[PDB]
Design a protein around this ligand. Sequence first.
Ligand code: CLA
Ligand SMILES: CCCCCCCCCCCCCCCC(=O)OC[C@H](CO[C@@H]1O[C@H](CS(=O)(=O)O)[C@@H](O)[C@H](O)[C@H]1O)OC(=O)CCCCCCCCCCCCCCC
Ligand SMILES: CC(/C=C/C=C(C)/C=C/[C@@]12O[C@]1(C)C[C@@H](O)CC2(C)C)=C\C=C\C=C(C)\C=C\C=C(C)\C=C\[C@@]12O[C@]1(C)C[C@@H](O)CC2(C)C
Ligand code: SF4
Lengths: 135, 119, 197, 317, 180
Amino acid sequence: LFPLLILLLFTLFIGFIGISFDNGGMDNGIAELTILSKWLTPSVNSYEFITNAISSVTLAIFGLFIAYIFYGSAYSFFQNLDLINSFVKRNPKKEFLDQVKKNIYSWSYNRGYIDIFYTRVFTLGIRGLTELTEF
Amino acid sequence: FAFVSPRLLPDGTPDVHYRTACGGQKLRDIMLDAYIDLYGPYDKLLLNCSGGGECGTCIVEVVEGGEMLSPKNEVEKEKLKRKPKSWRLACQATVGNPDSTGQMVIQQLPEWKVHKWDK
Amino acid sequence: KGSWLPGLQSPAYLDGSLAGDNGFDPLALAEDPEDLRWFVQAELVNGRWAMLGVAGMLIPEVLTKAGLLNAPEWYDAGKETYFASSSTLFVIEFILFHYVEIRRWQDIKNPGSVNQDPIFKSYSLPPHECGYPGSVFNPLNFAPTLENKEKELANGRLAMLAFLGFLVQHNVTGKGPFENLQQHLADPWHNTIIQTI
Amino acid sequence: RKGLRFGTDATGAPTAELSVRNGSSLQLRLNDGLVTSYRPKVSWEGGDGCRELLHTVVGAGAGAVRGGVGLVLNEAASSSSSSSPLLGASEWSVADVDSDSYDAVQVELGCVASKLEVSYVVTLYPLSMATAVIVKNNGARPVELTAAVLSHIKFDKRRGTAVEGLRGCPYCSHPPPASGFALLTPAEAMKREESGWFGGGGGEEPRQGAWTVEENLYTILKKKVSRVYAAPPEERKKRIYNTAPSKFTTIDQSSGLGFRLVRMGFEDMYLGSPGGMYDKFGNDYFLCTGPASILVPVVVGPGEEWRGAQVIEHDNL
Amino acid sequence: TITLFLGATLALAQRDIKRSLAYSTMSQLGYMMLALGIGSYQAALFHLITHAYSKALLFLGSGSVIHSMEPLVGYSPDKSQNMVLMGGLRKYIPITRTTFLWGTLSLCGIPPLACFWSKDEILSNSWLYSPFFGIIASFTAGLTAFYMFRIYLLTFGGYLRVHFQNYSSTKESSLYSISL
Ligand code: CLA
Ligand SMILES: CCCCCCCCCCCCCCCC(=O)OC[C@H](CO[C@@H]1O[C@H](CS(=O)(=O)O)[C@@H](O)[C@H](O)[C@H]1O)OC(=O)CCCCCCCCCCCCCCC
Ligand SMILES: CC(/C=C/C=C(C)/C=C/[C@@]12O[C@]1(C)C[C@@H](O)CC2(C)C)=C\C=C\C=C(C)\C=C\C=C(C)\C=C\[C@@]12O[C@]1(C)C[C@@H](O)CC2(C)C
Ligand code: SF4
C-alpha cells in the first residue's frame, strides 16, 4: 500500500509539467508557473483549444456514461433507470443488435484473429520446412 | 407444448419454476422467453453472452426429458471436459419442433448448487 | 463531540447538549452552570454582531475597489459628512439600544416575562427559547434545528477572529485588508507580519 | 420465564429482543405476531446496521397501530364474500424456544380452541428474519383462510424508491382493497387504498399484466399502487403447468440497500405503496409487500395442514 | 493509428484484468506512435510520462485485488483475476480502491487529473494534421473512456457475485426453519 499511495501522489502532480497555455494558472508561485517545465525539450484560454478539449471530454463522458448504463449498479442515484425502464420495453432492433454482439465478442475471444494467423502459417510452415530439409 | 420445468439456482427444498414452451427453437431463446435467468451473474453488454458461440457460460443440467433434445455437437464435447455426462451447453442445441407432447425438467446453471442431495 | 484534542477527555461542564460543544475550556471558566449560560448568551450576541461587522468591513471594500460603488473605508467613514451629525445619530442609537438591550436582559433574568409588545395586546409574541427568539425575528419560519445552531456558532466564532484580525491589521498598517490580500497574493513570502516590523 | 440468549421483556405488552452474535436483533411482540423492528448489520463501518421497518408511534393506550410484519390470517367464510370474519381473537402461547447457537433464535406462538390449531414460527438467522404459519385443521367441514403477511418495509425518499426482478408476472391488477388484501390488519396497516390523482392502470378487475415492464418498477403513483402479482385466478391457474410466478427483490436509489423477499408455500405478492396520503404516516417513504394465498379460496381439508413462509434476506453486507 | 484502434477494440469483453490492462496499454502506445509521426513529439514524451505512472498504478492495484480475493476462490488464475465472479470491493478494501479509481479516471481523461493535458494536445495536433485518422483518434479517445471504466465498474461495484445468494448459497442454509 505504501507504493500505491506514493504513486497516487504522482498521478496527480505530474499534470503540472505541461499544465496549460493560458497564463500558466497563477501570478505568484515562482516555482516555474507559466514557463511550463517541459523546457528540457529541444532548445482567456485559446478558444479553439477550449472547444477541442470540450469535444474530447464530451466523447470521454459519453463513453463513461454508456459504461455506467450497461455495467454500473442501480442502487445509486446516477442510473436514472426511467429510460432503462423504457429501453427494454420498446427495444426495436433487439433481433439485429444481438447479432452485432454475436460478432464483436466472437472477435475479442478469438484474440484478434491475426494471432491465429501466425499459428496456422508460421509455426506450421517451419514445422514442415524442417521435415522437408530432413527428407 | 414441450412442457418444461426449471430447477432454478439451488435454494432450500426445491426452487422450481414452470413454463409451457412450443418446441422448435434453441434452449437459450426458449429460456429467455420465460424470463428465467440462465447466464448466472453475467450482465447484458459484453460479458459472456450473445448466443451460439464460444465462451460457454450456460451449462444447464438436464435431469428429466433428456431423450428429446438434439444430439450433442462436438463443440459441446470440447468446451465440457469438466462435464459429467449429464449436462450440455444449451446455446448450440435445439428441441424438436414436432415434439409438442414432451415433458422435460431442467436444473439451471451448475457449480452454484448443492444438490443430488435430493432424490 | 469533536474534542479538538484527539486524546484529551472533555470536562463535565460541556456535555454536548448545547450546540458547538468541543470541551474547549482549558481554564475551567464556565464550570458553574449559570455562568455557562451567561457566556452562552455572550458568545451568541458577540458572534452575531461580529458577523455583522465583518460583513460591513469586507463587502464595502471590495465593492468600492470593483468600481461599481464608492464608499469610504469603515475607519475612513467617521470623518465623512452625512445628512446627520455624529452626536445626533449617536444619542438616538443610545436611547433605542437602552430600550432593546434592557428588554433582552430582562428576558435573560426572567424566562418568558417581557414577551408582549406592551403597546398592543395581540400581535405580541409566541413563547420562545432563550438565545433564540420567536416569531418577529424568524419570519421565514426556519426550524431552529441542530446543524443550524452549530453553523451559526462556528461562523460567529470565526467572525470574531476575523474582526480582531481586521482591527489589529489596521492598527499595524492602517490600510484596507483586501489590499493586504492583493499584496499577499503577489508574494505570500514577501508579504506577511514579518516584513512589516 | 424461559430464555437462553434473549429476554422476554414487557413494554405495554410482552415482547422479546431476539438477538444474534452479529448485532442484528428483532423486537417481537408476544401479544400478537406483529414484529416491531428488525436491525440487521448492513454496513461495515458504523458499528452496526440500521434500516428497519416503518414503526409508527404509539397511539391510544398501548398504541399497537403500527404494522410491520403482522400476520393477517382470516377465514373465507362459506356464507358470503366476507373474507374478514376474524383473526380468531384469542390467547397466544409461547413454546419450545431454541437457539442452537448465539447466531439464531426462533419463537413459536400457538393459538387454538376457537379456530383450528394455528402455529406461528418467527426465526432470526445471522442475516434474515422469517415468518411461517401452520394452519392445522379438522372437524365438521374443511375450513378456509387467507394467510397473509404484510411487512411494511421502509424506503428512503419516495422519489427514488422502486423494485426490480418481477418483470414477467400476470400482475392481476385487481386489488381487493382496504388492507392491501386480507382485512383484519395488524391493528393498523392502511385503510381504503384508492386512487384519484389521474388515470391509473387496470379496470380494477383485469389481468392486464403480461408485465414486460423493464428492470425497474418506479412505484411512485401510490396510495393505491397495489396489485397481486401471482398467476391469474384459474384462467391459467386451472390446467397443468401453470407458469409459477416469481420471487421478489427491492431497491432504493437514494441509500443503496437491498432486501430480497422470498416466499415459500404462499401464492401471491402484494406490492403496495403510499405516496399520496403519506404526509400523515411519517416522513421518508414506506410500502407494504408480502406473500400470501388469497386470490382463490383456500379450502384445506378435514385433517390436513397448510404451509406458508416469508423470508427477508438482504445479502447486503 | 492502426495499432491504436486495434488494441482499443480488443479490450472489449476481455474478462481477465491482467490481460485487458495489457490491451489498454498497447492501445495507449498507439497514441505515442501516432504523435511521433507528426513531429510534435514534445507532447508525445509528456503523454508517455503520464501513462507510465497511470498504468503502473493500475497493474499494482490489480495485483493487490487478486491477492485479496484469492483466498475466497481457489488458488487459480481464471478462477481469480476474472472480474465477472469478482465485483464489488469498495466496502472491503478502500485504501487500494481509491487509488484504482483515481488512476483509471486519470487514464480515461478528466481535466484535474493527469493523462489529460497530453492526449488533448496530441488530439489537437492530429486534427490539425488531417481528419483521415484524426477522426479515428477522436473515436478511440471515447472507446478508452468506455472500457477503462467498464473494468472499474465491473470489479469495484457490486455484491461480490461469488456470494450474493442468487446463484451461490454458501453463507447460511442449515438454520433449522420452522420446527417440528
Ligand atoms: C480570519 C482570520 C485571519 C485571516 C484570514 C488573516 C489574514 C492575514 N493576516 Mg492576520 N491576524 C488575525 C487573523 C487573521 N489574519 C488575528 C486574530 C490577528 C491578531 C493576533 C492577526 C494579526 C496580524 C498581523 C499583525 C498581520 C496580519 C497579516 C495578515 C495577512 C498576511 C498573513 C500574515 O502575515 O500572517 C497573519 C498573522 C497572524 C498573527 C494571524 C494569526 C491568526 C490566527 C493564528 C488564527 C488564524 C488561523 C486560521 C484558521 C488560518 C488562516 C485561515 C485562512 C487560510 C482562511 C493576511 C491577509 C499581516 C499583514 O497584513 O501583512 C500583509 C500582518 O502584518 N495579521
Ligand atoms: C503492415 C503489413 C504487415 C504484414 C505482415 C508482416 C508480418 C511480419 C512479422 C511476421 C510475424 C511474426 C510473428 C512471430 C510470432 C512468434 O514469434 O511465434 C513463436 C513461434 C515459436 O515456435 C514454436 O513455439 C512453440 C511454443 S508456442 O506455441 O509458441 O507457445 C513450440 O512448441 C514449437 O516447437 C515452435 O516451433 O515462432 C515460430 O514458430 C516462427 C517464428 C517466426 C519466423 C519469422 C521469420 C522472419 C519473417 C520475416 C518476414 C518478412 C516479410 C517481408 C519479406 C520481404
Ligand atoms: C475574539 C473574541 C473572543 C475570543 C475569546 C476566546 C477565543 C476565548 C477562548 C477561551 O475562553 C475559552 C473558549 C476557554 C478557555 O478555557 C480558554 C480561552 C482561550 C480563555 C470576541 C470578539 C468579538 C468581536 C465582536 C463582537 C465584534 C463586533 C464588531 C462590530 C459590531 C463591528 C462594527 C463596525 O463594523 C461596523 C458594524 C461598521 C463599521 O463602519 C464600524 C464598526 C463599528 C467598526
Ligand atoms: S454461445 Fe457461448 S457465447 Fe454465445 S452466449 Fe451461449 S455461451 Fe455466451
